């Protein structure tokens, strides 16, 4: 079911949602692009702004594990956490949890390539041990996959 979404992550990857800043170096951009392809409405803004938006609009999940369940059901799931400086967001996909706790994701990052996941890293390998346990998972109420 998550196909529709996976596709959306790979296509959204090479794109540049904002100006001359390619998605692979802009988490907010990458998410907006995936939401574009799927025609899902995502708050405008930078990372923090996106988190505030999701906080207010979106249904909030209780665990990374459930996040991967919803994601497996062809829903769109955004892992988000705010920062003092630059917050971060990532698209949660289905598959094995790292350390039985952190679900696989796709995200670009200004941090550099190390913070970039092409479905090969969990949110637990893009956020550090502290931030890793403070993530919020948000889900859109309609299964973008058919």
């Amino acid at each position: 079911l998550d196909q529709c979404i996976v596709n959306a992550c790979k296509n959204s990857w090479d794109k540049s949602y904002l100006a001359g800043t390619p998605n692979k170096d802009n988490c907010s951009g990458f998410v907006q692009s995936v939401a574009a392809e799927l025609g899902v409405p995502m708050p405008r803004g930078n990372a923090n702004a996106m988190v505030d938006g999701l906080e207010q609009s979106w249904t909030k999940l209780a665990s990374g594990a459930e996040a991967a369940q919803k994601a497996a059901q062809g829903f769109l799931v955004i892992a988000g956490l705010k920062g003092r400086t630059y917050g971060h967001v990532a698209v949660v996909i289905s598959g094995p949890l790292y350390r039985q706790k952190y679900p696989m994701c796709w995200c670009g990052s200004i941090a550099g390539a190390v913070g970039q996941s092409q479905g090969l890293k969990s949110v637990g390998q893009v956020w550090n041990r502290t931030d890793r346990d403070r993530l919020n998972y948000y889900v859109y109420s309609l299964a973008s996959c058919s």
């Binding site: 988490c27 630059y86 971060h88 941090a111 550099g112 390539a113 637990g124």
Partner: protein
């Protein structure tokens, strides 16, 4: 005080260890990524530092995800400078090589960066990962990262 980058490589005979050494300091990480035998970063502490001038070692027990070869050693062997990140935020953090205590930490979120004989350079309005692609570029002292 000058920092030279320390290349981090697989150690033979220790199955998932990556590190590097020089005359003064050995640094080591363990790879816990199930899928990748050639990872770019280590998110699970400890980092092991060995002080070869004293024969002692110590562990750094917590820390941002560490970038393989964003590790740098100071000319005298007293400081170990490391690039660490989480989500979109990042930092450069200098540790004491004898005690593993953090001596200095600088938030560099949103910036491209580079470290060389000359010092530290940070940049914005970049077109790429290298600081040279950055429109605005700022040169920063590394003196607080390593002191006497």
């Amino acid at each position: 005080c000058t920092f030279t980058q320390l290349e981090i490589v697989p150690q033979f005979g220790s199955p998932n260890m990556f590190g590097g050494e020089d005359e003064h300091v050995r640094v080591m990480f363990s790879n816990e990524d199930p899928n990748d035998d050639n990872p770019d970063a280590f998110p699970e502490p400890p980092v092991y530092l060995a002080d070869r001038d004293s024969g002692n070692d110590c562990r750094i027990e917590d820390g941002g995800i560490w970038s393989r070869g964003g590790v740098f050693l100071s000319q005298d062997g007293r400081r170990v400078l490391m690039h660490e990140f989480s989500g979109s935020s990042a930092e450069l953090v200098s540790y004491d090589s004898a005690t593993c205590k953090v001596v200095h930490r600088e938030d560099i979120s949103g910036q491209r960066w580079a470290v060389d004989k000359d010092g530290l350079r940070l940049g914005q309005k970049c077109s790429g990962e290298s600081v040279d692609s950055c429109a605005k570029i700022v040169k920063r002292s590394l003196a607080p990262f390593c002191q006497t």
